Ligand binder design. Structure first.
Ligand SMILES: O=C(O)CCCN1C[C@@H](C(=O)O)Oc2c(NC(=O)c3ccc(OCCCCOc4cccc(F)c4F)cc3F)cccc21
Ligand SMILES: CCCCCCCC/C=C\CCCCCCCC(=O)OC[C@H](O)CO
Ligand SMILES: CCCCCCCC/C=C\CCCCCCCC(=O)OC[C@H](O)CO
Ligand SMILES: CCCCCCCC/C=C\CCCCCCCC(=O)OC[C@H](O)CO
Ligand SMILES: CCCCCCCC/C=C\CCCCCCCC(=O)OC[C@H](O)CO
Ligand SMILES: CCCCCCCC/C=C\CCCCCCCC(=O)OC[C@H](O)CO
Ligand SMILES: CCCCCCCC/C=C\CCCCCCCC(=O)OC[C@H](O)CO
Ligand SMILES: CCCCCCCC/C=C\CCCCCCCC(=O)OC[C@H](O)CO
Ligand SMILES: CCCCCCCC/C=C\CCCCCCCC(=O)O
Length: 366
């Protein structure tokens, strides 16, 4: 209608922006991932597969942009038109599954070879999405006079797409969204548990160390040290790997330094004990810094994935469903269709948004 003028103004800009930004980001990311120097992890296998999928998709965007810059004329042949749709949807649902499986893996890593397991999972995802999407290859370039069209909805496609939507809405969108959400809510829950317990024990340690600093005799210092050691042994038990070994070691040597101070408290030597207490405080602060940095990174990756997933996909799937259920052959539903165009652009922008995850979760080590 006049939706077409908006499409021909809007799609070229956003597609070219996604293309250049995404080539840059995904190229840097894949270059980093394929280097044999750094030790390979499973999350890197998932991120590599995701970057490769997004880059394959991004390579088709110049053709989409060309199509609209020509006033919605397709010049690239019937096979390329088929590949357009195939690559769009293969990328989209492979990306959703890569993110979701990465999330399940992280949750299980907190609760509970894995490199080969990640490669097998990614191969399964590739095969699933590519096999289940093959009927998109039946849709080709349609021609009306002198204007070969592509990328459009039409009656020839509708009967398929409508049903093909719902299944894809349930299995490719809502299921992974729910899985992602539940895994990350459970992770937030375990993090809040450990942080609450750690603050609780922190408070007892601060109180009894303040008592030790404000020392009156050898009995009160020993009493405060006994309380401290009790609180510290509670924390060591409720601790639930490089980061996990450092924490257990810190807890053990903290209990050791408290036993050192208690030895001094039996001898009635008050000054020695207070010096030991000060050095124990230094140790505790070191351990807390090391934990807090890890905590912040762990939450940042989770929230970024929820934001990207949410905003890129759920508006687009919602509006795509609504647009398909109301579609009439002759009716112009300009405003809804325009909304769908905007959210389709957001969904395509995922291929250049994902390198943020590669930023934060990727190089976070040291
Ligand atoms: O520009 C414009 O005017 C606006 C956009 C026009 N336009 C262009 C047109 C076009 O592409 O040319 O597409 C539409 C659709 N398409 C669907 O509604 C669809 C809906 C679903 C779907 O699924 C593919 C994958 C199937 C397998 O899914 C699985 C996923 C995960 C796990 C599994 F096991 C799966 F099996 C494909 C779809 F095209 C709906 C509404 C409009 C359009
Ligand atoms: C990000 C940049 C978004 C580009 C929007 C440009 C645009 O919407 O232009 C269409 C115009 O408003 C309708 O003719
Ligand atoms: C806005 C800048 C974002 C930052 C620039 C980022 C990448 C450069 C890609 C810029 C691509 C510009 C394409 C402009 C365009 O295609 O406009 C044609 C018009 O919309 C059809 O009638
Ligand atoms: C209009 C928007 C203007 C675009 C601005 C910046 C694009 C930045 C793209 C570059 C991002 C690449 C950095 C990256 O992904 O890092 C790799 C990762 O760390 C591997 O482990
Ligand atoms: C049309 C051009 C297609 C461009 C292919 C994009 C790169 C994809 C895989 C390379 C990764 C190597 C491992
Ligand atoms: C996750 C995605 C999985 C799938 C990824 C697929 C990647 C395909 C890349 C580029 C295809 C572009 C095809 C463009 C071919 C050029 C056609 C041409 O040059 O025209 C030929 C002739 O003029 C007319 O028959
Ligand atoms: C999560 C919830 C988000 C769903 C948001 C909006 C629903 C969109 C409903 C829009 C229905 C528009 C139908 C229409 O366009 O009416 C026909 C037109 O007026 C004849 O010319
Ligand atoms: C309104 C339609 C949405 C168009 C989407 C524009 C894409 C933004 C590109 C880069 C930002 C993030 C750079 C990641 C590095
Ligand atoms: C990765 C880089 C991918 C390169 C793919 C396509 C380059 C541009 C080809 C299309 C130009 C259309 C000109 C008419």
């Amino acid at each position: 209608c006049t939706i077409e003028n908006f499409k021909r103004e809007f799609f070229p800009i956003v597609y070219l922006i996604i293309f250049f930004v995404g080539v840059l980001g995904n190229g840097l990311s894949i270059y980093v991932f394929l280097q044999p120097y750094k030790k390979s992890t499973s999350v890197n296998v998932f991120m590599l597969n995701l970057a490769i999928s997004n880059l394959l998709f991004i390579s088709t965007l110049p053709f989409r942009a060309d199509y609209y810059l020509r006033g919605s004329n397709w010049i690239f042949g019937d096979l390329a038109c088929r590949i357009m749709s195939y690559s769009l949807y293969v990328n989209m649902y492979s990306s959703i599954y890569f993110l979701t499986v990465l999330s399940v893996v992280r949750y299980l890593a907190m609760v509970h070879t894995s490199i080969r397991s990640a490669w097998i999972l990614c191969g399964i995802i590739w095969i699933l999405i590519m096999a289940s999407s093959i009927m998109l290859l039946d849709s080709g370039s349609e021609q009306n006079g002198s204007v070969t069209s592509c990328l459009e909805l039409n009656l020839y496609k509708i009967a398929k797409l409508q049903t093909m939507n719902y299944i894809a809405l349930v299995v490719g969108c809502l299921l992974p969204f729910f899985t992602l959400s539940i895994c990350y809510l459970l992770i937030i829950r375990v993090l809040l548990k450990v942080e609450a317990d750690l603050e609780d024990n922190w408070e007892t340690l601060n109180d009894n160390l303040k008592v030790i600093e404000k020392a009156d005799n050898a009995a009160q210092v020993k009493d405060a040290l006994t309380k401290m050691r009790a609180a510290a042994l509670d924390a060591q038990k409720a601790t639930p790997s490089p980061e996990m070994k450092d924490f257990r070691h810190g807890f053990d040597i903290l209990v050791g330094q408290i036993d050192d101070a208690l030895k001094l408290a039996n001898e009635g030597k008050v000054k020695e004990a207070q010096a030991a207490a000060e050095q124990l405080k230094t140790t505790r602060n070191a351990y807390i810094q090391k934990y807090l940095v890890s905590h912040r990174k762990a939450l940042t990756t989770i929230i970024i994935t929820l934001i990207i997933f949410f905003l890129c996909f759920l508006p687009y799937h919602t509006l795509r469903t609504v647009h398909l259920t109301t579609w009439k052959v002759g009716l112009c539903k300009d405003r809804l269709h325009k909304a769908l165009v905007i959210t389709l652009a957001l969904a395509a922008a995922n291929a250049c948004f994902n390198p943020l995850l590669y930023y934060f979760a990727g190089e976070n080590f040291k």
